[PDB]
Every structure is written in C-alpha cells, then in structure tokens.
Amino acid sequence: FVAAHTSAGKTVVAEYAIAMAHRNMTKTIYTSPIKALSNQKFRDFKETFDDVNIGLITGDVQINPDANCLIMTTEILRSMLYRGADLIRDVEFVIFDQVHYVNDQDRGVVWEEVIIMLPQHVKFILLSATVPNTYEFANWIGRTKQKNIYVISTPKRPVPLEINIWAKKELIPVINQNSEFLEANFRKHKEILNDGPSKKTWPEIVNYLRKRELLPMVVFVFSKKRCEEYADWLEGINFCNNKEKSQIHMFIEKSITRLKKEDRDLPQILKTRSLLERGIAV
Amino acid sequence: LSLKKHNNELLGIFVPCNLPKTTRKVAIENFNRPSPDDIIQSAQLNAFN
Numbered sequence: 451f452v453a454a455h456t457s458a459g460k461t462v463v464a465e466y467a468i469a470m471a472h473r474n475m476t477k478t479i480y481t482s483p484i485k486a487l488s489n490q491k492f493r494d495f496k497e498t499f500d501d502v503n504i505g506l507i508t509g510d511v512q513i514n515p516d517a518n519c520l521i522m523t524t525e526i527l528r529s530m531l532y533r534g535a536d537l538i539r540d541v542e543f544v545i546f547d548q549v550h551y552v553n554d555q556d557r558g559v560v561w562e563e564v565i566i567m568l569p570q571h572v573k574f575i576l577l578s579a580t581v582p583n584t585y586e587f588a589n590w591i592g593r594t595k596q597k598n599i600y601v602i603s604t605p606k607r608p609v610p611l612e613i614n615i616w617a618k619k620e621l622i623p624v625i626n627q628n629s630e631f632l633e634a635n636f637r638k639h640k641e642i643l644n645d646g647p648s649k650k651t652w653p654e655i656v657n658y659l660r661k662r663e664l665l666p667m668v669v670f671v672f673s674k675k676r677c678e679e680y681a682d683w684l685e686g687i688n689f690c691n692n693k694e695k696s697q698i699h700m701f702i703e704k705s706i707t708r709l710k711k712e713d714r715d716l717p718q719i720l721k722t723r724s725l726l727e728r729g730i731a732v
Numbered sequence: 733l734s735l736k737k738h739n740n741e742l743l744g745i746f747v748p749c750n751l752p753k754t755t756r757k758v759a760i761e762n763f764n765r766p767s768p769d770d771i772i773q774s775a776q777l778n779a780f781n
C-alpha cells in the first residue's frame with residue numbers, strides 16, 4: 451500500500467510490477483475508478499513499453515483481449531469475475547489506482563465486491579493520496595484476504611508550493627514553501643488596496659508572468675460562459691512564431707479527418723482552431 | 733516365430749524405410765529438449781510458489 455503526496459512518482463511502482471510480470475510470464479490488470487483516465491493510461495503505457503502487449507477493455511471499446519497487460523474498469527472486472535473467465539488463473543498482480551476517489555456510494559459497493567470475489571493467488575498493489583482513512587482500508591483487505599500488506603508513506607511533497615496574492619499590478623508572497631503564514635505581507639496587501647475582472651485585467655497578467663519565465667498557466671473559472679468571455683478578452687497575444695502554428699494546423703487537420711466532411715464546419719471547431727493557433731484554449 | 737523376432741517394428745510408430753542415420757539422430761535430439769510448455773512452466777514457478 452502506497453500513500454504518497456501528489457507528483458511524487460507513484461507510477462514507478464506500477465511499471466516495476468508490469469516488468470516483473472513480463473519477466474515471470476504472468477498477467478497484470480490495471481483498474482481506475484474513472485473511465486476518462488483509462489484511455490490516457492493506455493496511451494502512456496503503450497508509449498512506455500515496447501516488448502509488452504497492452505490491451506483495453508471498456509464499455510465502448512475492446513482492444514487486444516489476449517494481451518498480457520490489460521487496462522479495464524472496475525465494473526468490467528466485476529462482470530468478468532461473475533462470468534468466471536479463464537484468464538484470471540494467470541493473473542499475478544491487480545493494481546488499483548486513485549483509491550481515494552472510491553469513497554462514493556456508487557463507486558463503493560463494486561470495489562468491495564471485486565475485492566471480496568478475487569481468488570487467493572492474486573497479489574495487490576494500491577496507490578492513492580494522503581487521506582485520513584488509510585490504515586482501515588489496508589487492514590480490511592489484509593483481514594479479508596489473509597495476506598501481508600505493507601503501508602508506505604512519504605514525508606512531504608518533493609516539489610514545494612507557495613501561495614501568493616495579486617493586487618494592483620504586482621504579486622505579494624504571503625505563504626512560503628514551509629506553509630507558514632506571513633502576516634506582514636497580508637497587512638501590506640490590505641493597505642495598498644486602500645468586484646470582478648475588467649477588460650484590461652487578463653492582459654495585465656499574461657504579460658507580467660511572461661517576462662518572468664513562468665508562462666505555463668492554468669486559470670480556473672467556475673462558469674462555462676465566463677471562460678469564453680475571458681479568452682475572447684485576450685486580443686493581440688500570440689505564442690507561435692511561424693512553425694508551431696503550421697504544426698498545430700497539421701495536427702488538427704489530421705485529427706478531425708475521422709469526422710464527416712460536413713461535420714467539420716461546426717462553429718465550435720472553427721473557434722477552437724482559431725484559438726489554438728495562438729496558444730490559447732478553453 | 734517371424735512376428736516374435738520382428739516386433740517393435742511391425743507394431744511401432746511410423747519411421748520411413750530409407751532414413752539416413754543423420755536425420756534419425758537429429759529427430760531424436762530435438763525431443764530430448766524442453767517442450768514449449770516446459771519453458772513457460774519453468775518461469776511461472778517464481779510467481780506462483
């Protein structure tokens with residue numbers, strides 16, 4: 451059982467498990483609560499491993515069912531166990547990623563049933579983040595399956611984070627990398643300021659951070675409509691000089707070939723293409 | 733008495749009449765090596781103790 455901070459390198463354990471299974475000529479099953487992550491992990495594993503066949507089993511697709519490495523959803527595994535598939539006899543490792551996202555009601559019963567129904571020759575690898583309820587999951591699994599499981603945790607984040615506040619064309623650091631609040635900086639922030647964004651607000655930020663070599667930016671707006679307005683407010687700003695635009699255009703043109711000819715003229719596609727040529731997206 | 737002294741050839745598996753000893757030896761040598769199942773079962777021992 452591994453419970454480490456985010457961006458600490460949890461995927462190294464899964465890669466080593468897959469390599470061990472390939473060396474022993476056994477099978478591995480990878481499972482995630484969310485179907486969105488399955489495709490991304492499938493692509494990542496296909497790129498990373500060249501001597502190992504990778505498969506995918508979801509409610510929409512089914513690629514290489516006979517491969518030695520399979521990525522599927524929890525309900526797919528539940529149905530497979532209920533049917534009594536013959537490939538389970540060769541499975542050595544089952545990996546559950548993002549365990550801390552399974553504390554829901556619909557996601558909870560299927561996970562417990564899958565854990566209960568698994569045979570005794572299968573070993574477990576568990577990955578998640580730091581959550582208050584960590585020892586209980588491991589204890590329950592080790593009691594139900596009567597197996598030895600080790601709980602491994604990390605002290606702190608390998609990369610540190612800081613919290614700042616922006617006000618009137620400069621940035622005030624108020625929490626440092628040690629998670630210690632700075633009262634004087636907050637007081638100065640209160641003093642210097644003595645509603646919503648304006649039309650000349652996002653340009654005032656896309657230039658200050660650009661000159662500081664901190665360009666890669668993700669802005670969180672809690673509204674579908676406000677994001678489009680904010681993106682449209684950024685006018686006369688570009689990040690592709692002459693070849694990045696051509697490469698992006700080629701990638702977009704090749705990608706949307708799978709659609710029909712009259713389905714590529716939709717306004718959303720045109721607006722996204724126009725925005726993507728300058729390095730801005732929603 | 734002819735049958736008694738000619739067993740193991742009259743009632744055996746098929747081997748061609750004019751088979752050179754070299755080909756016979758090569759055929760015998762192949763079957764004295766692990767089968768495809770043997771190799772896979774050898775490696776799976778470390779996984780399932």
Ligand SMILES: Nc1ncnc2c1ncn2[C@@H]1O[C@H](COP(=O)(O)OP(=O)(O)OP(=O)(O)O)[C@@H](O)[C@H]1O
Nearest residue numbers: 454455456457458459460461462547548577578579
């Ligand atoms: N010991 C290490 N030293 C240097 N780099 C490492 C080390 N371990 C992992 N990395 C790098 O971390 C990068 C990404 O880390 P990773 O994706 O595993 O974080 P994560 O914990 O899985 O995030 P999440 O919470 O979303 O699951 C990898 O590209 C890897 O090169």
